[PDB]
A paper describes a structure:
Nuclear translocation of the p50/p65 heterodimer is essential for NF-κB signaling. Upon activation, p50/p65 is translocated into the nucleus by the adapter importin α3 and the receptor importin β. In the classical pathway, importin α binds to importin β through its N-terminal Importin-β binding (IBB) domain8,9 and to [name]-cargos through its C-terminal 10 stacked Armadillo motifs (Arms) that collectively form an Arm-core. Importin α possesses two [name] binding pockets located along the concave Arm-core surface: an N-terminal ‘major site’ and C-terminal ‘minor site’ between Arms 2–4 and 6–8, respectively.
Similarly, the best diffraction data for importin α1 (~2.20 Å) were obtained from crystals bound to just the p50-[name], while a complex with both the p65/p50-NLSs or just the p65-[name] diffracted to 2.40 and 2.82 Å resolution, respectively. Only the isoform α1 crystallized bound to the p65-[name] alone. A 2.8 Å crystal structure revealed two p65-[name] peptides bound to the major and minor [name] pockets in slightly different conformations. At the major site, the p65-[name] occupies sites P1–P5 in a p50-[name]-like conformation, with Glu300, Lys301, Arg302, Lys303, and Arg304, making a total of 11 hydrogen bonds, 101 Van der Waals contacts, and burying 724.2 Å. Unlike the p50-[name], which inserts Arg361 into the P1 position and is stabilized by Van der Waals interactions, the Glu300 in the p65-[name] orients away from the P1 position. The p65-[name] also occupies the minor [name] pocket. This binding includes ten hydrogen bonds and 88 Van der Wal contacts but no salt bridges, with the Arg302 occupying the P2’ position. Unexpectedly, in all complexes with importin α1, the p65-[name] adopts a fully extended conformation at the minor [name]-site, with the P1′–P4′ positions occupied by 301KRKR304 residues; the α-helix 306YETFKS311 seen in complex with importin α3 is missing in these structures. In the absence of p50, the p65-[name] binds the major [name] site, mimicking the p50-[name]. Meanwhile, importin α1 residues 75–497 are perfectly superimposable (RMSD 0.26–0.39 Å) in all complexes of importin α1 bound to either p65-, p50-, and both NLSs, underscoring the rigid structure of this isoform7 that can stretch [name] peptides at the major and minor binding sites by making extensive mainchain contacts.
Residue numbers in the entry:
A (entry chain E): 75 to 497
B (entry chain C): 289 to 294
C (entry chain B): 435 to 442
Write the structure that this text describes.
C-alpha cells in the first residue's frame, strides 16, 4: 500500500534493490481490482524508468515487475497505451521475448498483445519492430501440449490481436507468416486456445475475398465446422462468425463450407437460446440463399426452410430482419419449384405480419421478396391464387397502407403490386 | 442479388 | 476483450 510519492522516491533512489521494491509496489498498485492510479503513475514520469528496467538482464525480478506494471498501464485507455509505446516499450518487450525465464517472456507477450490490440496503428508498429518472428519462435515445439497452459493461451491471444482490426487490414506477408501456426493452434485441444484461434480466423476472413481465399487455402473450413458444433459457446461464437465471413465470398468458398457439413448444425444454431447466435446463423443463411441454385437446393434438402420460416415468425427483430434478407435472396435466385416449396412451408403469413414493422429497410426487402414470388406465380400462372393467400392473412391491408409514406421505393413497389395483382 | 458483408 | 489487465 505505497503512495505514488514513495514509489517515485524509490525509483529515483539509484539503488537497484530500492528500485525493485518501488517497482513491485507500483505493480501491486496497478494490480488492484478497484480503479488503479494509472494516470498518476504516467504523470510521475515512471514509464521511461520502467522501460529502462526491462533491459536490466542482471536483475530478472525488476524485469518481471516492470513488465507487469507496464502491461497493466497498457491494458487501459488508448492514451495510456500510447504513453507506454512512447517510452520505447515495443523494442524492449520484443527483446524480452527471448528471456530465459518463462514468466518474463510471458509478460512480454502479454504486453505486446495489449499494445497491438489498441488499433491498426500500434498493431503494425509492433509488426514493423519484428515481433512476429520471435513470437512464432516461442511455439517451435513438436507438441504444443508440452507448453504451459497459460503460456499458450497468452501467445494465442497475442497472435489474435496481431490479426485483428481492419482499416487497414494486417499486412499480407504477416498473415502468411502467422497462418500455419494459427492452424496448429486451431487443432489444439484447449477451449480458450480454440476460442482465440477462431477469433483470429474470423478477423482474417472479414473483408475482400482474396483474404477469405488465403484462409481457406490452408484447409481450416472442416475444422471450423467441427468447432461450430462445440458445446462451449465461447468457441461456437467465433467459429460461426468465421463461417459467416467465409460464405460472403465466391460461390466456390461457400461450397467449400457446405461440403464440410455446415448446414447440418444450423437447425441448432437457428434455435439457439442466445439471440446473437441466432442472428449470426440467420445472416449466414442469407448469404447462402444468395448463392447458386444447387446451393439453395442444399439448404432445402437439410430441411432448413421450416427453420427460416420459424425465425421469420418469432425471433429477435434483428434476427427477423436477417431472415427477411434470406427469404428475398432465396426468392431472387431460386427455381420456380423452390419458391413453391417456400410458400408451401408457410412463408406468407409471417412475411405479411412483418409489414407492420417500424423499419423502412425490412419492409423494402419483404416487398421486394413479394415481387419475386409474384414473378414466380406469373411463370406458373397462379397469380390470383397467391393474391387470395395474401388476402386471407391480412396482407392487402398492409400493402394498401404502405403504398403511401416517406420512402420512395416503398410506395413505388407497393403501388406496382396493387395495380398489377389487385384490380 | 448480392452477398452482404459486415 | 481487446485489452487485458493482470489482476495478480
Amino acid at each position: 500500500n505505497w503512495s505514488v510519492e514513495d514509489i517515485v522516491k524509490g525509483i529515483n533512489s539509484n539503488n537497484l534493490e530500492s528500485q525493485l521494491q518501488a517497482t513491485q509496489a507500483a505493480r501491486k498498485l496497478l494490480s488492484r481490482e478497484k480503479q488503479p492510479p494509472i494516470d498518476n503513475i504516467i504523470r510521475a514520469g515512471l514509464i521511461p524508468k520502467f522501460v529502462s528496467f526491462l533491459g536490466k538482464t542482471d536483475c530478472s525480478p525488476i524485469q518481471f515487475e516492470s513488465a507487469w506494471a507496464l502491461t497493466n498501464i497498457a491494458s487501459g485507455t488508448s492514451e495510456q497505451t500510447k504513453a507506454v509505446v512512447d517510452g520505447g516499450a515495443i523494442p524492449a518487450f520484443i527483446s524480452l521475448l527471448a528471456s530465459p525465464h518463462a514468466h518474463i517472456s510471458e509478460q512480454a507477450v502479454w504486453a505486446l498483445g495489449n499494445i497491438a490490440g489498441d488499433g491498426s496503428a500500434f498493431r503494425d508498429l509492433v509488426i514493423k519492430h519484428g515481433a512476429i518472428d520471435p513470437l512464432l519462435a516461442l511455439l517451435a515445439v513438436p507438441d504444443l501440449s508440452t507448453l504451459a497452459c497459460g503460456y499458450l493461451r497468452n501467445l494465442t491471444w497475442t497472435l489474435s490481436n496481431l490479426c485483428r482490426n481492419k482499416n487497414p487490414a494486417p499486412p499480407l506477408d504477416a498473415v502468411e507468416q502467422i497462418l500455419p501456426t494459427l492452424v496448429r493452434l486451431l487443432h489444439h485441444n484447449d477451449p480458450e486456445v480454440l476460442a482465440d484461434s477462431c477469433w483470429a480466423i474470423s478477423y482474417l476472413t472479414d473483408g475482400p475475398n482474396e483474404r477469405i481465399e488465403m484462409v481457406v487455402k490452408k484447409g481450416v473450413v472442416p475444422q471450423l465446422v467441427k468447432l461450430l458444433g462445440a458445446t462451449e459457446l465461447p468457441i461456437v461464437t467465433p467459429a460461426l462468425r468465421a463461417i459467416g465471413n467465409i460464405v460472403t465470398g465466391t460461390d466456390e468458398q461457400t461450397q467449400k463450407v457446405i461440403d464440410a457439413g455446415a448446414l447440418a448444425v444450423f437447425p441448432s444454431l437457428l434455435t439457439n437460446p442466445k439471440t446473437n447466435i441466432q442472428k449470426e446463423a440467420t445472416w449466414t443463411m442469407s448469404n447462402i440463399t444468395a448463392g447458386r441454385q444447387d446451393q439453395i437446393q442444399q439448404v432445402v434438402n437439410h430441411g432448413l426452410v421450416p427453420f427460416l420460416v420459424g425465425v421469420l415468425s418469432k425471433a429477435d427483430f434483428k434476427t427477423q430482419k436477417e431472415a427477411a434478407w434470406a427469404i428475398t435472396n432465396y426468392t431472387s435466385g431460386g427455381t420456380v419449384e423452390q419458391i413453391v416449396y417456400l410458400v408451401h412451408c408457410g412463408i406468407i403469413e409471417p412475411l405479411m405480419n412483418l409489414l407492420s414493422a417500424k423499419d423502412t429497410k425490412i419492409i423494402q426487402v419483404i416487398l421486394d421478396a413479394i415481387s419475386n414470388i409474384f414473378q414466380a406465380a406469373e411463370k406458373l400462372g397462379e397469380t390470383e391464387k397467391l393474391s387470395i393467400m395474401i388476402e386471407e392473412c391480412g396482407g392487402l391491408d398492409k400493402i394498401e397502407a404502405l403504398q403511401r409514406h416517406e420512402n420512395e421505393s416503398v410506395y413505388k413497389a407497393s403501388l406496382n403490386l396493387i395495380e398489377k395483382y389487385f384490380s | 442479388e448480392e452477398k452482404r458483408k459486415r
